[PDB]
From Swiss-Prot:
Residues carrying covalently attached carbohydrate according to the record: 119, 135
Recorded superkingdom: Eukaryota
Membrane topology: Multi-pass membrane protein
Name by which UniProt lists this protein: Sodium- and chloride-dependent taurine transporter
């Protein structure tokens, strides 16, 4: 009950599901240390500024993800809607990951781990024990492929959903619905098991990562950046996506959190601490993952680049292999699975609660008694239906598609650039300065102004231009080539969320009555000073 423990408990859970799952696979795909530089560049130039901006928006507007924009600038309020849609797409695969962990939980209660040996039913005759095996013939990899997912030849015929994954996803969705319906009262102490538990586990891995034989090669590879991959543009796209995924920005959840936060909240310290802790956690996770990969390369003899899958699910391949080497593998495996499940459940709770809060703030009584609860189910079950498409036999391809196009890609970058352009240019930097000064009692420095006005919008524009101009066909584990129609489907899924901005703009422009300048300025000016509209904003707000 000390001051330090209190100020630590005040700060929410810095650990995230993307830090333990998405960041390792992204770092392994991007080459290791070559990915660290763009990640740090985006965290310093764009991550923390956008995080602070969204926290300030939430704390000042005291509204959801959409109503805040209506209060700030109705013309671009459609942006908020798009964000909500993205959230849904996120869940479409996010909760699915939890089901996987759930299955591993039921596999963690045996004396002998299933991924330890090859002498099993689901393992193919090509399975070779570590005591060598190829990328697709390792015991843990064979287990993860042909016992949890049960991959298909391709996305042309996904087949029927697996009953095990279906039951796991159903149970997890029931837990998620009951946590909101009955309510969770153990939050005040849940940090004691959600905040301290992951980091310590990483320590148990880190001390083990340096202890694993043959891990020096993976560590030396991780500490060697490659300039040829830096010249390539996909690393920058992956870094910009991972920054937004880790900081949870561009999803409107941080806006709802700031709205729920008190008015006299010093957001600068929170933003700085969260950024530093996320950077440190990502560095430690990458170090441990590459140590594990070096150990696996030494044990199997294959090249470090060809050790495991260069795609989603790298955690379920890397962590059990390291736990098997640890003494008493059952205990550490159960601890890691419980920690991962709790982190993912907390992230899903936050995202779903933010989305429901935004949709209930936009449409009234769509939050009156039972009306607030039933709608929740109307979301969850529907998502569960989409979750079915991900729990199919060849559902990993649809999972990769939704991860690359639906909830990531050009969509998040476009939405973030538009938010920054509306706040800095349309709304005004001086207005935001005065708002922050009235809120927290201090005026931010010129660095935040230059980042919100020039650095972040131009950086996002360049990133999205590099993404659109130079595009590579999506592949799965560098072995399966997605069909031509799959690329079009992914682009259509991305454009469905991207086009939400101009459509609402045109709708509001046609909705407002009056001259053209009046029609535009009634949507540009906030709803609060809606007495008479200055048809031409002077050069003073724009240049300054
Ligand atoms: Cl990250």
């Amino acid at each position: 009950s000390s001051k330090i423990d209190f100020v630590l408990s005040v700060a929410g859970g810095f650990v995230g599901l993307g830090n333990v799952w998405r960041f390792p696979y992204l770092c392994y795909k991007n080459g290791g240390g070559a990915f660290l530089i763009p990640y740090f560049i985006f965290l310093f130039g764009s991550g923390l500024p956008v995080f602070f901006l969204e926290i300030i928006i939430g704390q000042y507007t005291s509204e959801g993800g959409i109503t805040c924009w209506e209060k700030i600038c109705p013309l671009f309020s459609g942006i908020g809607y798009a964000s909500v849609v993205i959230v849904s797409l996120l869940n479409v695969y996010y909760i699915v990951i939890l089901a996987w962990a759930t299955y591993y939980l039921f596999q963690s209660f045996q004396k002998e781990l299933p991924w330890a040996h090859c002498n099993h039913s689901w393992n193919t005759p090509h399975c070779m024990e570590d005591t060598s095996s190829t990328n697709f013939t390792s015991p843990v990899i064979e287990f993860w492929e042909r016992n949890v997912l049960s991959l298909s030849p391709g996305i042309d015929h996904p087949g029927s959903l697996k009953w095990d994954l279906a039951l796991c996803l159903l149970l997890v969705w029931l837990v998620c619905f009951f946590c909101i319906w009955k309510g969770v009262r153990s939050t005040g102490k849940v940090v004691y098991f959600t905040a301290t538990f992951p980091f310590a586990m990483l320590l148990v891995l880190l001390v083990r990562g340096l202890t694993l034989p043959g891990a020096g090669a993976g560590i030396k590879f991780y500490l060697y950046p490659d300039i040829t991959r830096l010249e390539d543009p996909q690393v920058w796209i992956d870094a910009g996506t991972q920054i937004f995924f880790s900081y949870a920005i561009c999803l409107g959840a941080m806006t709802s959190l700031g709205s729920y936060n008190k008015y006299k909240y010093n957001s600068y310290r929170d933003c700085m601490l969260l950024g530093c802790l996320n950077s440190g956690t990502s560095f430690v996770s990458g170090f441990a993952i590459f140590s594990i990969l070096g150990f696996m390369a030494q044990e199997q003899g294959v090249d470090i680049a060809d050790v495991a899958e260069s795609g989603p699910g790298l955690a379920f391949i890397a962590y059990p292999k390291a736990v098997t080497m640890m003494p008493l593998p059952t205990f550490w495996s159960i601890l890691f699975f419980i920690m991962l499940l709790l982190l993912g459940l907390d992230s899903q709770f936050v995202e779903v609660e933010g989305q429901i809060t935004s949709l209930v703030d936009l449409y009234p009584s769509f939050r009156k008694g039972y009306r607030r609860e039933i709608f929740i189910a109307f979301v969850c079950s529907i998502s569960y239906l989409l979750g079915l498409t991900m729990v199919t036999e060849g559902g990993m391809y649809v999972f990769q598609l939704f991860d690359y196009y639906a909830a990531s890609g050009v969509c998040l970058l476009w939405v973030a650039f538009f938010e920054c352009f509306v706040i800095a240019w349309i709304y005004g930097g001086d207005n935001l300065y005065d708002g922050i000064e009235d809120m927290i009692g201090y005026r931010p420095g010129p660095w935040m102004k230059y980042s919100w006005a020039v650095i972040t919008p131009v950086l996002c524009v360049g990133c999205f231009i590099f993404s659109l101009v130079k595009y590579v066909p999506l592949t799965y584990n560098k072995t399966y080539v997605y069909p031509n129609w799959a690329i079009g489907l992914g682009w259509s899924l991305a454009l469905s969320s991207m086009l939400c901005v101009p459509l609402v703009i045109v709708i509001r422009l046609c909705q407002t009555e009056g001259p053209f300048l009046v029609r535009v300025k009634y949507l540009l000016t906030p709803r609060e000073p809606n007495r008479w509209a200055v048809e031409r904003e002077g050069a003073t707000p724009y240049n300054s």
